[PDB]
Amino acid sequence: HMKSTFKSEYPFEKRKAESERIADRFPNRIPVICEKAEKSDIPEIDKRKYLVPADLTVGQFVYVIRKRIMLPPEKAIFIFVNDTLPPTAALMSAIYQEHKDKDGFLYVTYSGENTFG
């Protein structure tokens, strides 16, 4: 199966164009994209689109992920950005400011495994 969904629907230029407006819509927001690693064994999300605020932290985002897949408390889920595991106080705001891309939108990834690769 594919990998990207909400970001696969359209090309990049589409996203960049989106963030170009989201900047005039919600400046006090943090556009990100939750994704599930392939190696992972957990259930992949339905779509990759998460508009977290500039207040929500990293340890606060996961929760949102644990909501979609409604993963039980008997499972685990770790975030990964560029193959790096950010802290909890790593305000998603300061995260999307260091993990931003040409498109502007963030690209996070969660996996039941806290491994690298």
């Binding site: 629907e9 359209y10 927001r29 998460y50 508009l51 605020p53 606060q60 949102v64």
Partner: protein, 34 residues
């Protein structure tokens, strides 16, 4: 991914579900994503 070829002119894109205001569901802002 998809890219342009040659010449200059409008562009055409596809879609599966989204497309409308790059959002067509509960609510992107929905706390569901935060």
């Amino acid at each position: 991914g998809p890219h342009m070829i040659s010449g200059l002119s409008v562009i055409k894109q596809e879609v599966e579900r989204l497309g409308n205001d790059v959002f067509e569901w509960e609510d992107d802002e929905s706390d569901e994503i935060a």
